[PDB]
């Protein structure tokens, strides 16, 4: 019908990638941590701290010999997008029965004894077996049994002075309630799968941080400068358009955000540019049209925007030849609610019929086509006021109006059970 | 204040003097017309989340429906009010007016608009330097120098619409107001304008409250006088450092306030992982990720549907403010009114109309009496066994 | 030995920018209007405690004050650390030694056995946080000019970091070190930290212009919960 | 049209809640058989929990929309009921109360849902231009004009 | 009758309100200390949500 509708985005682009990353050539040690033979016990584990790599992920896990590949905080496909600023590789051997028992939130003899991980992680956990290895009746392999309290997550202990459960204070005496803490694997060839050696890794980092290094192998490209792509720094991505800055940062200022956090300006990792980050939707289009029984003439409103950059931001190049008609042409007017397009502007003046907005209105004219105007008020006039003259009515008329007014409505009801989940009583 | 009055059987108090009084009453027409992105303000250019988003049926054709029906709403509030007569009257180039003085309201022929000077001290007494988003979306039209500047696409959706009337059309109503009813009456806004010189016509506004005619023709230079001080107070107070138009400020406040709320919500995560789409986009695989995807679509969705409905009670009480200005149009402005307090305090004499950014001011004109006299007093006379009785 | 500090403290919590904002922040602060320790040890530089961190500013004239340590066993029983200057560039040494009971650095006494790693990088004052959570060791830094002979201002200065340390290790008490002209071998201000709550505001270009504590009086708490700064 | 707007909102608000029900909120399928008979009740219940918040959500803001249409309605009933009193019942003095021009009476017309009422009104026309004076002097006295 | 329909309306709106505490709404108990002294904080924090 006559009127200007408000319509939803729906045209469509096509979008390419950029990556950005900085200059990291060397790589790093998970050659040797992974195949070595002195495996740290549990109750002491190794700590590792990683950086300046461009070590591959699906070198380790496509790899079979791993049995467990358990992880987290990411999904395991996209471990070679992303930087990590440390990385913590842990080693210890444990039981088969207990790999369980390595996942956040558990309980058993190793959870709450001898390593326990946060609630809030964000890591990877690696396991395998090692029959084969450390199994002879290898009595080398030690683990802590006892303590006064509980595991504090991401804390080792280290200690000799034995058990207390009375009130004797047993001097390194072996009796009742007074125990030692340290006790040997059984570690015999001759036992079932949940008794074998196996060898446990564990990492652990934490993501979106500013000067971060540790990221593998993904190629740079080059930027495409103000189209819409996929963008990729340093681990965080987005779709927008790519814009040259001027904002004044600081030595060490990664990127910027708004009230809404919400990143919009990030820092090239190879120039040390700043690009500020625009979205590319464009849904603030309307379109003035008379009825569709009557013509498919269209006109269309670009909201808040001038005129000169309309083929920019609607990206006309990339729509339908239909769509570039509307973009420019010789109907091309700039109005204070944007740039109107399609519309032969007047220089007359008449009252309104479709509003557009700020004084202008639109309307179907007799070679007929959509014209533009300014809205006129009413009919000027001026009354012949003097300071002794008085003007008295001669006849009348008598008038009939009408007025129209609401005064009820449909009186509706909603059997709510029907409706949610009709005649069905497992609902 | 305590007090006490004398009565009796037999006394009866009556003024000698009066005096004209001017004063100012303020209300609210039309409020801000926004308009918001679904897509844009839920999840922004990711086809993952926009898939998602429909299986949630028409949740956002709803919404824009009952934004749209509040922004069309508020422009037939101000055509309501102020497009009363539809013929623009001029005022007249000379003015002899019988002594009264209507410099400070009628349009001022110096400056290229046609605001009063009334109407530019009203003019700067609504600020908009506290309000949140919508003095940042209002930078926009005034950052002329930057090319390559959209700025639709840069709130998450929010937008604001400009007024069908502007602010020149909306003084060029009242001006049209003004020059009707100084010099024609009330025979205006009752079929055509009929002129009538100036005392005639207060001559026959004293003779509707109930004082006859000859008190205004041997009293005109000493109502004049009073009429143009209280004028001149109304502009002295309003000049000063007060702060007049507190209810046209509290609707400005209370639009800022909830769209301000509207984009801190945007960094709540719901219960997910992150607050950030691209994150969890960019951290997980498709199986794993539309469940937290679900819980940010889930918040995000009530919190623009809390958005719409305080909206939505909110216009209903800009619309009975509406009604009731358009009424005070029709009953004090183009006529006079017979109730009372309803135009003023004291009795009716005759009102004039000034714009005020997003609402309408009207000065009322009352007559108050003066310093009364004690007497004595009688229901009727005796004369020859006969009762006599005052005709008024 | 007590003196008010009136909005020293403040830093750049994060390392992200934002123009014309007025953001909160919920982090370890020095609290406003508190009680710092007047130190001159002219006729001691003894050990003080790492509670949850420690503010350092001093009022120095021709760079008396060479640097600290950081660390509780003393005698290369755990780890340690020792921050000095060779009078060109800054040096970052954790190492163990054992300490003196009266140290300082002659115009002296280290042996290390086994150590983990190091590093090498009234005019005007240097202030100073320490701040030690689990993985870093970041050192902030405040270096203004200033007329006054002894005492903080009543100004308000927040700039930006220098350096972050991947230690990993624990400190539970400090000392630091001057600049005696002999080399002997015989045997400014100190503040600590609190988790409050603050709400910040950047201008133009992303500085922090000015602060908000939301624990000291009910009408900061007024100020915090209308999240402005006029009431 | 005023009376036909009524009529076309609270049919598309009844629409609207119908076309509701075919969506499904994030479970496996939007009927609720489908998903009975493919699922033991184990994990049916988080599908059909799924179902049922996103259901009540339809109603509710049904119900809220409707009580602010009812509450519009409500104040142009209360508006009939006064012009029924002073523009019928009696012949009012309030400008542009009961049509433009000077009341003389009005006559009321039932209408669907609605109320239609046709104001008789006094319009003068045909004027002329003369010369007034505010008194006229006789001897030495003024004299006023009685109406 | 008026005077009240206002108090009649308020003194339901606020039971109402208060009768909505004793439902679980999906989860085990609508009781909080029964999901904080039965389960984990790893476990509770889908049946608190
Ligand atoms: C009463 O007298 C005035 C003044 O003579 C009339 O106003 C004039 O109307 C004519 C009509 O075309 C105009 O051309 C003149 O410009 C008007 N004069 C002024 C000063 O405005 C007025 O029309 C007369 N009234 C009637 C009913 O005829
Ligand atoms: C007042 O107006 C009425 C009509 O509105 C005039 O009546 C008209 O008179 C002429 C001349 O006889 C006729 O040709 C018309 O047909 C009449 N119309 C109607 C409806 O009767 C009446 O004459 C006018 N009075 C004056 C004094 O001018
Ligand atoms: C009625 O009141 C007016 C003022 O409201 C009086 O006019 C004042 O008269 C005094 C003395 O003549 C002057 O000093 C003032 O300047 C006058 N004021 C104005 C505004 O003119 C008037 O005298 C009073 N009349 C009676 C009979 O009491
Ligand atoms: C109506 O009142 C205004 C306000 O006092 C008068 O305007 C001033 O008049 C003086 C007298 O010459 C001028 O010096 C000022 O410049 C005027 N001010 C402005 C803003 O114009 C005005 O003169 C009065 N009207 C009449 C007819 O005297
Ligand atoms: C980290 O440092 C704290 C603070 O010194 C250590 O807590 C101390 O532990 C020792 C060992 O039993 C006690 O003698 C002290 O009394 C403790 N001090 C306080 C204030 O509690 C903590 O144990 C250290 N953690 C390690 C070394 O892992
Ligand atoms: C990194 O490599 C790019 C491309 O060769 C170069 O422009 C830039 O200067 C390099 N930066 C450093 C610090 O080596
Ligand atoms: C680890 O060592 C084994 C030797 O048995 C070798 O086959 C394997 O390739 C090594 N792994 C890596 C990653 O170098
Ligand atoms: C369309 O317009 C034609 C006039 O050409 C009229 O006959 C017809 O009824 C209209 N149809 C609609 C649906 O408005
Ligand atoms: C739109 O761009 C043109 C091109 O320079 C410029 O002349 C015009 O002023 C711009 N519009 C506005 C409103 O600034
Ligand atoms: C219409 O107005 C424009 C500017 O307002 C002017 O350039 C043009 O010549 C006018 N055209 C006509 C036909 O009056
Ligand atoms: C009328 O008389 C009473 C008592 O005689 C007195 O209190 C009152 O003030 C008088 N009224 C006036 C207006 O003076
Ligand atoms: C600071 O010291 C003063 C005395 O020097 C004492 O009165 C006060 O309680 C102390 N603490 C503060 C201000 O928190
Ligand atoms: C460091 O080496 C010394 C030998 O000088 C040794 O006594 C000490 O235990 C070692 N510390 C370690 C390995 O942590
Ligand atoms: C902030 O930027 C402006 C330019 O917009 C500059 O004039 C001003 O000096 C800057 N403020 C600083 C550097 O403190």
């Not at chain 1, 007799?366 to 006849?395: D, F, H, K, R, W």
């Not at chain 2, 100012?24 to 926004?34: A, G």
Request: charged fraction near 15%.
């Amino acid at each position: 019908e006559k009127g200007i509708y408000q319509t939803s985005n729906f045209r469509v682009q096509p979008t390419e990638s950029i990556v950005r990353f900085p200059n990291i050539t060397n790589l790093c040690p998970f050659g040797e941590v992974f195949n070595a033979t002195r495996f740290a016990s549990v109750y002491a584990w190794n700590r590792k701290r990683i950086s300046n790599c461009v070590a591959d992920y699906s070198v380790l896990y496509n790899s079979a010999s791993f049995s467990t590949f358990k992880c987290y905080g990411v999904s395991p496909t996209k471990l070679n997008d992303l930087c990590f600023t440390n990385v913590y590789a842990d080693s210890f051997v444990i039981r088969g029965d207990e790999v369980r028992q390595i996942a956040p939130g558990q309980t058993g003899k190793i959870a709450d004894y001898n390593y326990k991980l946060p609630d809030d992680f964000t890591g990877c956990v690696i396991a395998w077996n090692s029959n084969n290895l450390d199994s002879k009746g290898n009595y080398n392999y030690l683990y802590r049994l006892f303590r006064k309290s509980n595991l504090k997550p991401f804390e080792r202990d280290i200690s000799t002075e034995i058990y207390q459960a009375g009130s004797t204070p047993c001097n390194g005496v072996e009796g009742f309630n007074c125990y030692f803490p340290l006790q040997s694997y059984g570690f015999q060839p001759t036992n079932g799968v949940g008794y074998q050696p196996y060898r446990v890794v564990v990492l652990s980092f934490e993501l979106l941080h500013a000067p971060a290094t540790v990221c593998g192998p993904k190629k740079s490209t080059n930027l495409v400068k103000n189209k819409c792509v996929n963008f990729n720094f340093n681990g965080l991505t987005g779709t927008g358009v790519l814009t040259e800055s001027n904002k004044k940062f600081l030595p060490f200022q990664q990127f910027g955000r708004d009230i809404a956090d919400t990143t919009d300006a990030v820092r090239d990792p190879q120039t040390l540019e700043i690009l500020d980050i625009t979205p590319c939707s464009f849904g603030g289009v309307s379109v003035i049209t008379p009825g569709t029984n009557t013509s498919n003439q269209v006109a269309v409103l670009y909201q808040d925007v001038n005129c000169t950059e309309v083929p920019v931001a609607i990206h006309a190049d990339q729509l339908t030849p239909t769509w570039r008609v509307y973009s420019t042409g010789s109907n091309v007017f700039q109005t204070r609610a944007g740039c109107l397009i399609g519309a032969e502007h007047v220089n007359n003046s008449y009252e309104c019929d479709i509003p557009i907005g700020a004084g202008i209105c639109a309307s179907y004219q007799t070679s007929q086509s959509i014209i533009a105007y300014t809205m006129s008020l009413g009919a000027e006039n001026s009354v012949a006021y003097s300071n002794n003259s008085i003007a008295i009515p001669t006849n009348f008329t008598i008038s009939v109006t009408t007025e129209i007014l609401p005064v009820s409505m449909t009186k509706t009801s909603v059997d709510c059970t029907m409706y949610i989940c009709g005649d069905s009583t497992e609902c | 204040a305590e007090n006490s009055v004398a009565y009796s059987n037999n006394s009866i108090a009556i003024p000698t003097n009066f005096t004209i009084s001017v004063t100012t009453e303020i209300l609210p027409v039309s409020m801000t017309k926004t308009s918001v992105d679904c897509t844009m303000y839920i999840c922004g250019d990711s086809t993952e989340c926009s898939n998602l988003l429909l299986q949630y049926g028409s949740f956002c054709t709803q919404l824009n429906r009952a934004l749209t029906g509040i922004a069309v709403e508020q422009d037939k509030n101000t055509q309501e009010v102020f497009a009363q007569v539809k013929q623009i009257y001029k005022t007249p180039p000379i003015k002899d007016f019988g002594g009264f003085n209507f410099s400070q309201i009628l349009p001022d022929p110096s400056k290229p608009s046609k605001r009063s000077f009334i109407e530019d001290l009203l003019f700067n007494k609504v600020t908009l330097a506290d309000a949140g988003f919508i003095k940042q979306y209002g930078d926009c039209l005034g950052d002329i120098a930057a090319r390559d500047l959209i700025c639709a696409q840069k709130f998450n959706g929010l937008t604001v619409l400009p007024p069908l009337l502007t602010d020149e059309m909306i003084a060029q109503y009242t001006s049209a107001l003004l020059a009707g009813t100084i010099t024609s009456g009330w025979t205006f806004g009752a079929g055509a304008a009929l002129q009538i010189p100036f005392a005639m016509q207060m001559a026959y506004r004293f003779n509707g409250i109930g004082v006859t005619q000859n008190v205004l023709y041997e009293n005109q230079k000493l109502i004049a006088n009073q009429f143009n001080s209280a004028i001149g107070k109304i502009q002295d107070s309003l000049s000063s450092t007060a702060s007049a138009l507190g209810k046209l400020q509290d609707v400005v406040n209370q639009n800022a306030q909830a769209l301000n709320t509207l984009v801190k919500q945007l960094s709540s995560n719901f219960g997910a992982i992150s607050s950030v789409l691209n994150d969890i986009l960019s951290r997980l695989d498709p199986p794993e990720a539309e469940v937290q995807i679900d819980r940010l679509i889930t918040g995000r969705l009530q919190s623009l549907q809390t958005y719409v409905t305080q909206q939505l009670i909110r216009a209903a009480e800009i619309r009975a403010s509406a009604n009731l200005a358009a009424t005070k149009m029709s009953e004090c402005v183009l006529g006079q009114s017979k109730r009372v307090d309803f135009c003023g305090k004291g009795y009716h004499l005759m009102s004039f109309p000034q714009s005020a950014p997003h609402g309408v001011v009207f000065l009322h004109v009352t007559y108050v009496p003066a310093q009364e006299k004690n007497f004595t007093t009688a229901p009727a006379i005796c004369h020859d066994g006969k009762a006599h009785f005052p005709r008024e | 030995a007590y003196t008010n500090s009136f909005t020293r403290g403040v830093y750049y919590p994060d390392k992200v920018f934002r123009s014309s904002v007025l953001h909160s922040t919920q982090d370890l602060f020095l609290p406003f209007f508190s009680n710092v320790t007047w130190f001159h040890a002219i006729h001691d530089n003894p050990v003080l405690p790492f509670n949850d961190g420690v503010y350092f500013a001093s009022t120095e004239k021709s760079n008396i004050i060479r640097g600290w340590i950081f660390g509780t066993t003393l005698d290369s029983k755990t780890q340690s650390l020792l921050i000095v200057n060779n009078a060109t560039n800054v040096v970052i040494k954790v190492c163990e030694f054992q300490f003196c009971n009266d140290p300082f650095l002659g115009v002296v006494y280290s042996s290390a056995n086994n150590c983990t790693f190091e590093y090498v990088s009234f005019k005007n004052l240097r202030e100073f946080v320490f701040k030690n959570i689990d993985g870093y060791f970041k050192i902030y830094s405040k270096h203004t000019p200033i007329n006054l002979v002894r005492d903080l201002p009543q100004g308000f200065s927040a700039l930006e970091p220098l350096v972050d340390l991947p230690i990993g290790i624990n400190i539970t008490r400090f000392q630091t070190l001057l600049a005696l002209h002999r080399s002997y071998l015989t045997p400014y201000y100190v503040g600590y930290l609190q988790p409050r709550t603050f709400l910040l505001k950047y201008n133009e270009n992303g500085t922090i212009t000015d602060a908000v504590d939301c624990a000291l009086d009910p009408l900061s708490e007024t100020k915090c919960t209308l999240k402005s700064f006029t009431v």
